[PDB]
Structure formats: structure tokens, C-alpha cells
Design a protein around this ligand. Structure first.
Ligand SMILES: [Mg+2]
Ligand SMILES: [Mg+2]
Ligand SMILES: [Mg+2]
Ligand SMILES: [Mg+2]
Lengths: 243, 243
């Protein structure tokens, strides 16, 4: 997939987990294809840095929001949606890249509190944030809501504990949303980045040589395709960046 | 499936949600096929009634435990496992029938608090209880751990919100567990009861005529098959009571 440089021109896209890794890559890449990108993350100064990088390249500084998905309330999610609604007439896209890995190890050992934290970030807060942004998404001529999945969201595997559970939940919640919007202007889908050179991947696989992995840059074609009009007939699906 | 009347003779099986509906049916039916049944539920007097019914038929009163999955802690789950361990040398089976439906309606409207409650009962507390009982399950010559799923745990559908999300999570968590135990003495699987004559079904489908549905009694063959040795080679699977 090699789209024109103005695929996303004027499309307003919110990118969560934007501080580093695949989230930062997608924010940069979406801005480079003409998007008006809105960044969301945990750390204010780390967001400022990504936004400044886009400003250095596009010459308009992206707006950012700090939101801690672990601790956020429904009302805090509504505050973000209210703040976006005050600056923009619509969202054309929402890419959820934020996620917590939690503990890798056997179910006999999984820490209950960490397990609850994984569910809270990956499922409940991602839901709460989504719900607050649905009205803005429906203002798009062709809105696109994307969740982050994993191969362990399709087939559970030993030691993947809360993470795998939360990615199965993410496929389910994506399928509910996609069915509810199916004949309307909003499409909803998941992306499995596959093994990619990130700190999360290295934490799970400390022996692996990350230099043998594709980078976040390498996997961008799929991320671009789901936000652009070439994917507009596709909803309810889960895609592998590296099949 | 028509097994001998002593299929489950002397097998010690914990049944959650045992106060009414499919949970109460399975507790009765397991006792009738020779099981030593342990009941778990919310209401003490409702449990006493089911246990008394089994005592009236088998002449030994089942032990019961009150546990509120909505509010229970890891330590409360460990207290149950400790109390079972003090009376019994093993668990031969654990059937999780407890579940919360939460709200049926569109994702734009799902109440966040109810959504969190559904996740807490159907996923996190069911996990916590499971983890606390794994050592007792491993003492069985052929232990069987069964989760309750739904057709909306395999394919998401409009208006199924937190419930569908939590049943996808339940398939994932069942697949992790099944992979971790695959070459050991514990098998792990899900059951989808299908549309059955219960208060949960009627709440979701108020127009439907429940008298046209199979009862919990009708769907028991599968519940019996998964606790008996005829299923001992099957793990990681999700079964429909009514295909
Ligand atoms: Mg390391
Ligand atoms: Mg267009
Ligand atoms: Mg009613
Ligand atoms: Mg036997």
C-alpha cells in the first residue's frame, strides 16, 4: 500500500499512547499524510515533544491531552470530548494504541491487582474514552475507530494472562461497535501490530533480538489504510500488520 | 448422551451461581449422578434451600459458601479455597455459572459503572476464584474447570455491550488456562447454554415466550459430559448446549 501524500488531508484523528512507540509513529505518519492529529497520553512533557516534532515538520502544533487511562473517570473522558468539540467540528478517526501489558507468567501466579489494572486500561477506560467520542466520530463523512489487538486476542496462549484476556475483550467490544454502526458512516476495526520493535515487546521477550524485528515505521501501511477512504467498506474486522 | 447413574460418584464439584437457574439445576443433577457438590452463591438462605433439596434426595447435606463476586477480594477467594481444603482432599470440578448481564442497549448509552460491575463479576472475580482453586483442582485424577460463555462471546452483536465483551474475555481466559494445563490432569472448557428458560434470558428478551425455550433440565447432558471421564481428552474448547 502506497497512497498519495494527501490521503488524510484535513482529517482530524485522535491518537492515544502517542508518547512513544507505535502511537508516536502513527501520530507522525498521519501528520505527514495531511492529518490534523490530536495526541493523547500520560506524560505532558513527552507529548509536548511529539507535538513539537510534528510542528517542526508541518508548521502547526498539534493539540494534546494528558489522560491516565488507569485512573480516569467517565467524566474525565467526557472533558476530553468537550475540549475536542470546542476546537474541532468532528473526529475523522480514533486510534487506540494505549495498553498495559501487566504480568507475563502462569495463571497460578498472576497478581490480582495487576490483572485488574490491565482490564481497567485495555478494556474499561478504552471503552469509556470511546463512548465519549462517538458523537464527534459520527460527524465525520467516513469516521474510522481502530483498536489495538494481539495474536493472543485471537488464540489464547500460556503466560499471557490479563493481556490475552483483555485483547479477547477488545475484539468483542470492537465487534459490538462495528455491528451497531454497520450501515452508518462509522467503521470500526482492530489492528494486531505483530512482533514490533517496542519496549512492550522487549519486556515480554527479553532474549529476543529486537533488531531482527520490523520497526513501527515498517508497519505503517496498514495504519494509514484504515484511516483513509480505501478501507471505507471494511468494518468489524481484525487485521494483521505482519501476516 | 445417556451416562450411567454413577458417572460422577465421589467426584467433588464446586458449582457457582447455585441458587437458581442453570446453577441450581447443575448442582441437583451432579448430586443425582453421585457427585459431592459444593454450592457457592450470594444469598445464604437461597443456598440453604438448594442444599436441603439435595439432602432430601441424597441424604447428606452439601456444603455451601456465600461469596459476592461483585465485591469479593483475592483474600476472600483464598478463604473459600482454605475452607474447601479443610473438608476435602481435592476438587474434581468447578463449574462457573455466576454471571451478571448488566445493561442491554447501545454502546452510546452503556452505563460506565454497570459496565465495570459486569467486568468485575464475569471476568475479574471469576479469575480470582479460579486462581485460588487451581491447587485443589490439580489434586484430581482428571480435574474439569468449566466457564459459562454465550453466542455473543464468539460473535459480538448490537446492544450486548459489557456482557458480550466479558464473554469474549471469558473465552480468552479459558484458552490461556487450557494451554497452560494441556499436558496435565486438568482440562478447561466453556459451555454456551444457548437460549434457556431463565430470569436472565427473560430480562434480555421480555417479548419472547419462555415456554418455547428448553429448560435448564433439558440442557444438562452437556454439563454432565464435561464433568465425567467421557470428555477427558477435550480441553480448550467451547461447546454449545443447543447447536
Ligand atoms: Mg529488559
Ligand atoms: Mg475522502
Ligand atoms: Mg421482565
Ligand atoms: Mg473415573
Amino acid at each position: 500500500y502506497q497512497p498519495k501524500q494527501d490521503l488524510l488531508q484535513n482529517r482530524i484523528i485522535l491518537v492515544t499512547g502517542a508518547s512513544d512507540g507505535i502511537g508516536r509513529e502513527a501520530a507522525l505518519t498521519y501528520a505527514r499524510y495531511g492529518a490534523t492529529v490530536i495526541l493523547l497520553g500520560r506524560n505532558e512533557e513527552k507529548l509536548r515533544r511529539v507535538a513539537q516534532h510534528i510542528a517542526d515538520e508541518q508548521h502547526v502544533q498539534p493539540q494534546w491531552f494528558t489522560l491516565d487511562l488507569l485512573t480516569c473517570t467517565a467524566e474525565e473522558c467526557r472533558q476530553v470530548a468537550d475540549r475536542i468539540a470546542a476546537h474541532y467540528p468532528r473526529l475523522d478517526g480514533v486510534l487506540h494504541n494505549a495498553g498495559l501489558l501487566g504480568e507475563i507468567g502462569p495463571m497460578s501466579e498472576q497478581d490480582p491487582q495487576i490483572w485488574q489494572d490491565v482490564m481497567q486500561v485495555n478494556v474499561n477506560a478504552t471503552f469509556m474514552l470511546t463512548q465519549a467520542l462517538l458523537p464527534l466520530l459520527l460527524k465525520s463523512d467516513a469516521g474510522s475507530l481502530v483498536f489495538t489487538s494481539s495474536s493472543v486476542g485471537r488464540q489464547g496462549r500460556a503466560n499471557w494472562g490479563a493481556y490475552a484476556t483483555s485483547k479477547f475483550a477488545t475484539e468483542g467490544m470492537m465487534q459490538v461497535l462495528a455491528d451497531e454502526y454497520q450501515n452508518r458512516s462509522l467503521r470500526v476495526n482492530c489492528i494486531n501490530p505483530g512482533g514490533t520493535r517496542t519496549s512492550m515487546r522487549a519486556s515480554a521477550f527479553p532474549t529476543e533480538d529486537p533488531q531482527k524485528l520490523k520497526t513501527p515505521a515498517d508497519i505503517m501501511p496498514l495504519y494509514l489504510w484504515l484511516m483513509g477512504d480505501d478501507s471505507r467498506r471494511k468494518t468489524g474486522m481484525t487485521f494483521d500488520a505482519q501476516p
